[PDB]
């Protein structure tokens, strides 16, 4: 059904499952020769580069949050706060 970027209702923060999966997912790509959006301070381990992209919040992904009834909310790694 979708939901406006306003009227948004989820948690402003990133869930462990999310972050967990983002890094993974992102690694996977980086490990696949996808483009890396951060300067590698010399890193060479994908999941480690991923940890970097994720701290300069330079990961081009979007976490779609399905709700019990099907509608979803879309947040960007950008927005989502990362406490953990």
């Amino acid at each position: 059904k979708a939901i406006p970027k306003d009227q948004r209702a989820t948690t402003p923060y990133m869930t462990k499952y999310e972050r967990a999966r983002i890094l993974g997912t992102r690694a996977l790509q980086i490990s696949m020769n996808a483009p890396v959006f951060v300067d590698l301070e010399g890193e060479t381990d994908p999941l480690r580069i991923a940890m970097k992209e994720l701290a300069e919040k330079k990961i081009p992904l979007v976490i779609r949050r399905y709700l019990p009834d099907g509608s979803f909310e879309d947040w960007s790694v950008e927005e989502l706060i990362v406490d953990l």
């Binding site: 709700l67 019990p68 009834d69 509608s71």
Partner: protein
Amino acid sequence: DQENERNISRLWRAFRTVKEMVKDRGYFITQEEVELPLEDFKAKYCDSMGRPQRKMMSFQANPTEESISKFPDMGSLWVEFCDEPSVGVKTMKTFVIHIQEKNFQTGIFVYQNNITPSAMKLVPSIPPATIETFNEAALVVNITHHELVPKHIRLSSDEKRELLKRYRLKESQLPRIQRADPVALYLGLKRGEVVKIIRKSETSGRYASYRICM
């Protein structure tokens, strides 16, 4: 004294409850018309020797102006008792009709030892009007006063259509309560009416819950 001084003491409390219940349902009654002590009770619904005259206890009741705010069409209620330890399918036409004429909506009847299976099958024969059947022995104590049973609340067909829209719930995904469930009767629910159960919690003082009916 003998063992009759106790068969009234029971009808008494039994009465008390009926009252309380009729007020929590959403009707008009004073706390003074309830706390009616034993003493002053005798000298009212008794005859000579000192025995109970039930046909003399029956009465009517009306909605509080508050119950009109949330429930518009909430009709009037009537309660009735009987001096007949063994009520039958004849004295029923007495009640069933008494209401179909006056035109109320809620009919509460109180049987003693029981009713005749020939009788009971005459309640769902005059809609809208609704009737309910209660045994004395089950109204001696108000079940709602028990340490465990927390308090429930009826939800307006408005308050309900909202509970769903706010949780994006379908009717069926809601926690249910029995049509026969003790408390469901104490308030007289109807297949579809939702109840809000508000209890205490060792995790967070109060927890709001809902129970639809089936």
